[PDB]
Design a protein around this ligand. Sequence first.
Ligand SMILES: [Mg+2]
Ligand SMILES: [Mg+2]
Lengths: 134, 128
Amino acid sequence: PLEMKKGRGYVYQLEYHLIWCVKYRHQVLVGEVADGLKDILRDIAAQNGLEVITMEVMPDHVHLLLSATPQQAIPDFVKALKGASARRMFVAYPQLKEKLWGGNLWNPSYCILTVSENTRAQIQKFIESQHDKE
Amino acid sequence: EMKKGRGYVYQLEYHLIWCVKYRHQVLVGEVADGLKDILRDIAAQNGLEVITMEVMPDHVHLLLSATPQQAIPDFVKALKGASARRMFVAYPQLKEKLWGGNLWNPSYCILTVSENTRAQIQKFIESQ
DNA sequence: CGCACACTCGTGACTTCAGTCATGAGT
DNA sequence: TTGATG
DNA sequence: CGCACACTCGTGACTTCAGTCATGAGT
DNA sequence: TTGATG
Ligand SMILES: [Mg+2]
Ligand SMILES: [Mg+2]
C-alpha cells in the first residue's frame, strides 16, 4: 500500500499541494490566459523534474499537486514555477499589463502543504500499534 | 493551525525512517533511550518539531514538522550524522559490533504526510 | 482597523535576465 | 492597484 | 555468487571535524 | 560485518 520510488541514497514518496494567488487578487486567469498558463506550468514542471498530479486554475489563484524527489527543495521549485510563469505569461498575454503594470503577476507569498495517501493520524496509529517500541 | 513565515504559509510533515548499519539489533535498553533524547535535542536545535518518534531494535521512525527552508537531505544529514557521532561518544559499547565508523545504513526512507488524505485533498481541489 | 501571506519600501541570487526566491521593516 | 486561497 | 536502500570502493560538502548528506560504480 | 524498514 505505498509505491515507493528509489534513488541512489533513499526510498521516497513525496507530494505537495502548492497554492498561490494573483497580485492584488485580480481575477485575470480566465479564458485563453488560463489555458496558456496551464501549458506554461506543465512545461516548467517537466524541465525541473517535477510531476504534475493535479492542476487547477481559478480566476485569482492556482493549485498544483506535485510529485518530487528528495533533491527538489521547495523554494527552488516554487521560484521556478512562479517566476518563469510570470515572465512567460506577460510576454504571451501582453493584455495582462492593463491591470498589472508594476511588474508582478503573482502575490509574493505561497502556501505549501505536504500530502500523503493515508492521514497523519493513521500513520501514528500504525507506528504505535507495533510491538517492539524500545 | 497553518504556520507562517515571511514569504509563505505552510504545513509540512514528514515520516522519516532509517535503519542501523548491517541491520544490527542494537537500539535497545539504554541505547534506545539515549538515542531518543539525542534526536529530540538535535531536532529542537535545528528548528524541526518532533510529532512522534519510536525506536525498534534496528530502525527508527520519526514524524517531524519543518519549514519550507529546511530541505530533506539537510535535515536527514543533521539527524543521522549528528546522532551517530553523539551515540558512539555516549555509548562506547556500540563499537563492539560497529567498529567501521558507521552507526547507520547510508540510505533513508521519507514520505510527505498530510492531516487529510491525498484522495480528499485531490477531490476538494476539483469541487470549487 | 491595522496589519501581513497578501500592500509598500529595502537587500542579494538567479532565471524568467524579469520577477520570483531568499529576506527586514513600516503601514 | 490588496483583503484572502490552502 | 550478483544485487542495492541495504555491502564495498570512489568523489566532494560540511558538521558531528566524524559520519552523515550529495553521488557513480562494482559486487 | 548486510538481507529489509517505509
Ligand atoms: Mg511584518
Ligand atoms: Mg547500482
